[PDB]
């Protein structure tokens, strides 16, 4: 589970394996984060030149 090949969990409180897997969505935290980083740099460069 730590390697994350199949998403289950272990239930120590009763001694079962329980379905952790119903999935996430990718590529939307990631998409934004990239766009943001480039943009801040591009603004900074241009500002030095202007002034």
């Amino acid at each position: 589970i730590l390697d994350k090949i199949f998403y289950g969990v272990l239930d120590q409180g009763n001694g079962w394996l329980y379905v952790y897997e119903t999935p996430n969505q990718d590529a939307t935290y990631d998409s934004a984060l990239e766009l943001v980083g480039q943009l801040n740099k591009v603004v900074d460069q241009l500002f030095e030149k202007a002034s």
């Binding site: 590529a27 998409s31 990239e34 766009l35 480039q38 943009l39 740099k41 591009v42 460069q45 241009l46 030149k49």
Partner: protein, 116 residues
Amino acid sequence: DAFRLIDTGALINNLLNKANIQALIHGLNRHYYSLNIDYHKTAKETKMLMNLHYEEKEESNLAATKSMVKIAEQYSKRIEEEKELTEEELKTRPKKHLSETADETLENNIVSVLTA
């Protein structure tokens, strides 16, 4: 273009002047000349030409529907194009091109929000 040869009988005022054209039709009958163009048309013809551009309703809407089905993918490719655009401008510090690429991406998003 619209043409006629020398043919006279009214064209006798046609090809500080006036010696020329009298001698021009007297030395030679039949030599080309251009003529002027105008277009006159009719209002029902006119309206027909503009209603080219409910079948209409069906089509615009059809594309709108199918655009919305596929948007999950259309989303992904345009972030990738955008990611590229940002990077190019960094190196660059041309301008028209970088702007146009960003303008297309923005136009498309508005149309997509509008669709639902």
